[PDB]
Amino acid sequence: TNPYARGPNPTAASLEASAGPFTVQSFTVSRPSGYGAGTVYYPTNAGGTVGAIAILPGYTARQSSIKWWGPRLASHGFVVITIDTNSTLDQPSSRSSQQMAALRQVASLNGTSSSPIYGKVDTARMGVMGWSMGGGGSLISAANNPSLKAAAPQAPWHSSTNFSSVTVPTLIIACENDSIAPVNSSALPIYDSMSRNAKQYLEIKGGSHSCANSGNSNQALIGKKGVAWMKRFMDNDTRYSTFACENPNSTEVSRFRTANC
Structure with missing residues (x-):
């Protein structure tokens, strides 16, 4: 029996719904350590x-751009921290450090007195996600920290596209019509x-650069x-293998590739 398995056998219906089986609360970090908020x-x-x-x-x-993931992923049984960077003009390398500082603080707060997530977190099982330079950041986090269990960047962008070092299970979410980080020169x-x-x-399909952001029509x-993907690879949850590796069964997918899944 998988000690990390939480919640039910999944269906397309249970995963396409706005929330999973877990009730969700949130708090604002009082004193962000090494990131903006x-x-x-x-x-x-x-x-x-x-x-x-x-x-x-x-x-x-x-x-606000990546907020919708918070309650979506939390409700399926993850602790999610959505961040602001120290500056909005921070580059992917700095974004990565800041994302690792956020995981560091979530992990600390698992043992912190008066924390609402006290003992809620398995600090050995962590995941990275992010939009554009935030996706690039997540991939740099994956390359630098191979103990990360899963990565799922969206419309990713970095100055280099060479991430051949990454051994972390990685879902690349891309927007077909993306003109800021075109799929041909970035995501692919x-x-x-x-x-x-x-x-x-x-x-x-038809996706602009914000096709995976809060308020998008394909949630x-x-x-x-x-x-x-996060259930299969963060929880080693083989009940999610088909959903993780199979085609989405959506008319709104313009391209789908998978390897070693």
Whole structure:
């Protein structure tokens, strides 16, 4: 029996819904350590410790762009911290450090007196996500910290697309019509560079650069896929293998590739 398995056998329906089976509370971090600001989303009733996900924004962007992931992932049994960077003009290298500082503080707060997430977190099981330079940041976090269990960046952008070092299971969410980080020059070369890992490329039909952001019209598809990947690889949850590795069954997917899943 998997000690990390939480909640039920999943269905397409249970994963496409706005919330999973866990009730969600949030708090604002009082004193952010090594990042601008943060909101932590947590399950009140997961039935065991759960892994932590740190989510980065893009250049100029703030929590509001990536906020929708917080309650979506928390409700399936993860501790999620959505962050603001020290500056909106921070580069992917700095964004990565800041995302690792956010996981560091969530982990600390698991043992911190008066913390709402006291003993809620398994600090050995952590995940990284983020939009654009925040996605680049997540990939740099993955390369520098191979004990990370899962990564799921969206519309990723970095100055280099060579992430062949990454051994962390990586879902690349891309927007087909993205003109800020075009899939041809960013999302796809990044995906292809990775030889040593379980990996997937999920491209959103008609999608502009914000196709995976808060308020997007594909939260059924994108939510299901992000939750399925994080469950399969953070929890080693083989009940999520089909949802994690299979085609989405969505008319709103323009391209789908997976290897070693």
